[PDB]
Structure formats: structure tokens, C-alpha cells
Amino acid sequence: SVLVQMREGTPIGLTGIYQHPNPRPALIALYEATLKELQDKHPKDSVYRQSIENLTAHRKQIVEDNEVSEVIENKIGAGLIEEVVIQAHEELELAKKMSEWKPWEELEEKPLEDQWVYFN
């Protein structure tokens, strides 16, 4: 299991989000899981997979290279490290749903010719 969001303890400035005890390992665990889900259920050609792989690898390199939370969040550039953990969890869930939805296919519903005509 991974602790994603602490809902009590020390407030950090954003209501409902409290200080995470051990954030870096939770980030690492979530990044491993999302990488694994991409590699086992996403075609290697899909741009979705390529993008998310590169992004997750980048963030995981940053978290492993750096021990201090402030330095990590400065290098990630996406909020406090608690918010970063929540982002990683959310990307992970999105990847698992994308496996079932299969967006890499061809588009199933084509629009009618009249569908997107405006007054120009």
C-alpha cells in the first residue's frame, strides 16, 4: 500500500492536505507502478504511453537524485511535494483507466459533415 494524502496532522497551507510523513518513497512506489502499467498494457507505439513514460522517468530521476523536499519541488515545478504525490497517484489511476479505454485506436464516431459549421 501507498499513503497518498494525509487528512490530519500538520497543516501545510492548503485546507484538507496535511504534511506527508515519508513522501519520497511514496513517489517512487507510485512511479514504479505507473511505469509498469504502461509497459504491460499500453502499446509501445502510442504517443500517450511515450509521453507518460518520459514524464514519469523525469520526475523519478529528480526524486531519486534529491533528498530535500524543497529542492525536489523546485525541480519538479508542480506544487508542494504532497500535491506531487497526489499528482502521481492521479496519473497512475488515469493510466489504469486508459488501459481499458484504449485511446490509441482510430476514432469510433466520425462527425457528420454539418456538425462543426459555424457562421464564418
99 lines the binding site for another protein (CB under 8 A)? no
CA separation for the pair 13, 104 (Å, rounded): 40
Identify whether the C-beta of residue 16 lies closer than 8 Å to the C-beta of residue 4: no
115 lines the binding site for another protein (CB under 8 A)? yes
**Three-state SS at 18:** strand
According to DSSP, the residues that pair with 18 across neighbouring strands are: 6
Binding to another protein, residues 36-55 (CB under 8 A): 45-48, 50-52, 54-55
User: What secondary structure letter does DSSP report for 20?
Assistant: -
Closest CA to 69 of 16, 25, 17: 25
Count of chain residues binding another protein (CB under 8 A): 67
67 lines the binding site for another protein (CB under 8 A)? no
71 lines the binding site for another protein (CB under 8 A)? no
Binding to another protein, residues 2-41 (CB under 8 A): 2-8, 10-17, 29-30, 32-33
Report, in Å, the least distance between residue 52 CB and another protein: 8
Closest CA to 25 of 104, 81, 97, 96: 81
Q: Which three cell numbers stand for residue 4?
A: 497518498
Report, in Å, the least distance between residue 3 CB and another protein: 6
Residues binding another protein (CB under 8 A): 1-8, 10-17, 29-30, 32-33, 45-48, 50-52, 54-55, 58-59, 73-80, 87, 89-94, 97-98, 101-112, 114-120
